[PDB]
Design a protein around this ligand. Structure first.
Ligand SMILES: O=C(O/N=C/c1ccc(O)cc1)C1CCCCC1
Ligand SMILES: O=C(O/N=C\c1ccc(O)cc1)C1CCCCC1
Lengths: 114, 114, 114
């Protein structure tokens, strides 16, 4: 799995250990071993949500499987919870795009996962 | 809907009000309320188009519906037009990837749509 | 085709000719003229792979066609090779998401390719 967070909150507002927390929480939520979990946080971005420049985040979670109706609602609660608590971003100013990747379309270490 | 524009144009070249205009123009184009439009501009990027370092842009427009043959042509005319007039980027040095997101695959406000 | 690389490797460690090298190699790999190739490298990123902050890369390759099981396995070798040599990134710390784009969903020059 791969989780990316793009946000206009300042780098200084990102708690030390945030990447580790995301990794551990996602490993638990997806059931995938932490060694296959990648996380990426991009602060200080020039963005607007609903025409407002208040804290917001545009995210994405890619995974080979483990993506679905009920699972995505659960991930959303988990992820919005972490963004609200750690980055002080209101859940209603967060978009998370979920992608169920085909194993043949995910490259890793000189091959794909197919 | 969410629109992201990555470009090598410097930050100082992005005119004041650019995100507001994108928000307003996309709300009109997609027919969605401005409140749900998210815009993200990333300048000063290390990128090339056709092996040239001249002004260029790589963009993406994600939306739950409102994505299609004729609509995408219209969005492209509108967006390349804005990038040319506001950022001085030639339309033929712009790529815009369109994504028709399934509601179940979009997280927001602790849940997902649909 | 469009190739994006997000990495925690410092900007100073990205060779000046890397975008051009990628452009040329990808043109050959995809059988498309170099002018059709766009490349984007984003260094100094805050990321973790497998819970580790050692050099890593999260990438994407979008193309209208030229994407598939065998081709993707080949692209992974080409790209891991370039990232390993030019950016000193271990190949098992590289993820590449491949996207086969419909021509109708790719905007360029005020229109789309459909
Ligand atoms: O690592 C990922 O998710 N799945 C991991 C995984 C777990 C178990 C496997 O046998 C194969 C692959 C990819 C990260 C990049 C985006 C697509 C999913
Ligand atoms: O279309 C979108 O807008 N978000 C919410 C929303 C509000 C109102 C609608 O009628 C539909 C969708 C998503 C934005 C994030 C990327 C997936 C599409």
């Amino acid at each position: 799995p791969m989780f990316i967070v793009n946000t206009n909150v300042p780098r200084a507002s990102v708690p030390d250990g945030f990447l580790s927390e995301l990794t551990q929480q996602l490993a638990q939520a997806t059931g995938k071993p932490p060694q296959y979990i990648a996380v990426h946080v991009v602060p200080d971005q020039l963005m607007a949500f609903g025409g407002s420049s208040e804290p917001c985040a545009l995210c994405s979670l890619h995974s080979i499987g483990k993506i679905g109706g009920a699972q995505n609602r659960s991930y959303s609660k988990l992820l919005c919870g972490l963004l609200a608590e750690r980055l002080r971003i209101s859940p209603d100013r967060v978009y998370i795009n979920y992608y169920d990747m085909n194993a043949a379309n995910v490259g890793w270490n000189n091959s794909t996962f197919a």
